[PDB]
Design a protein around this ligand. Structure first.
Ligand SMILES: Cn1cc(NC(=O)c2cc(NC(=O)CNC(=N)N)cn2C)cc1C(=O)NCCC(=N)N
Ligand SMILES: [Mg+2]
Ligand SMILES: [Mg+2]
Ligand SMILES: [Mg+2]
Ligand SMILES: [Mg+2]
Ligand SMILES: [Mg+2]
Length: 214
DNA sequence: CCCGGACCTGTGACAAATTGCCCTCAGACGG
DNA sequence: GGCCGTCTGAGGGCAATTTGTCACAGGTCCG
């Protein structure tokens, strides 16, 4: 069926802040690179629109604004920091974009690895829920189930959650609860969780999941 | 004992940003 | 050959929802 994205666990666990539309482009770049050094990639408006069910106009809007917002963004591997792009994007032909990814990032893309089909994620809206759905895939078994314990401090550092989510009731209300409900509504995964406490503080969240093909 | 204080939880308000939509008009191409 | 009819996509916008922030109500234990 649809394209199988694979990526090193190091990218899954990196520190960065990207919007939904930017994460969408990033999945296709990883796809192009892996099918091969170069680092020069390309995107056609009319193809983006068909994959994610957008019109050409709104696709054009999404590519263009995503693209100018990469400037100044950095990626951290735990630590080491890199820029995503080393030259501005540019369009040689109408309906075509050309981009220059940092060639030092190549080895981090292809390595202890993570994998999922693109149709699983293309309806998620909140970028933090994409981050969470990836980090769960890293632990999945062939049959489609898994269980993992993530530390709350590590979630805040790695997903670069905004500062007010250090108050636990806001963390619950605006990130944890909402994102477990997108995954349950928009992917083929069925997800549950429970809180681990130490004294008054909640320190970890323990996730279990299965696949709805069983 | 009960105080003020340092922790924790949940909800009500308001501000800022993102969503899918809508309209204009010229570029690229072929009949 | 060259104009025009169509398919694209590069611009300009919108209101309704969602995300980020902080005040206040209401629980416990410490000294
Ligand atoms: C379905 N839908 C989702 C939204 N909004 C969102 O999904 C949305 C809004 C935001 N906002 C933010 O990031 C907030 N950030 C911030 N205040 N600092 C993030 N997302 C993912 C709006 C509507 C919608 O249908 N709007 C159009 C309604 C209409 N005018 N007919
Ligand atoms: Mg959009
Ligand atoms: Mg009293
Ligand atoms: Mg008093
Ligand atoms: Mg009351
Ligand atoms: Mg009180």
């Amino acid at each position: 069926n649809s394209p199988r994205i694979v990526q090193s666990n190091d990218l899954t666990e990196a520190a960065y802040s990207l919007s939904r539309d930017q994460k969408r482009m990033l999945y296709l770049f990883v796809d192009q690179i892996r099918k091969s050094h170069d680092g020069i990639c390309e995107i056609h408006v009319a193809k983006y629109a068909e994959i994610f069910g957008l019109t050409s106009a709104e696709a054009s809007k999404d590519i263009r604004q995503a693209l100018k917002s990469f400037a100044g963004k950095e990626v951290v591997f735990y630590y080491e920091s890199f820029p995503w792009f080393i030259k501005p994007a540019h369009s040689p032909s109408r309906g075509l974009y050309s981009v220059h990814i940092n060639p030092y990032l190549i080895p981090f893309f292809i390595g202890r690895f993570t994998q999922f089909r693109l149709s699983e994620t293309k309806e998620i809206t909140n970028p933090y829920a994409m981050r969470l759905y990836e980090s769960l895939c890293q632990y999945r078994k062939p049959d489609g189930s898994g269980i993992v314990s993530l530390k709350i401090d590590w979630i805040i550092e790695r997903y670069q959650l905004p500062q007010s989510y250090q108050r636990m009731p806001d963390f619950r209300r605006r990130f944890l609860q909402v994102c477990v409900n997108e995954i349950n509504s928009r992917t083929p995964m069925r997800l549950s969780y429970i809180e681990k406490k130490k004294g008054r503080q909640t320190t970890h969240i323990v996730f279990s999941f299965r696949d709805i093909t069983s």
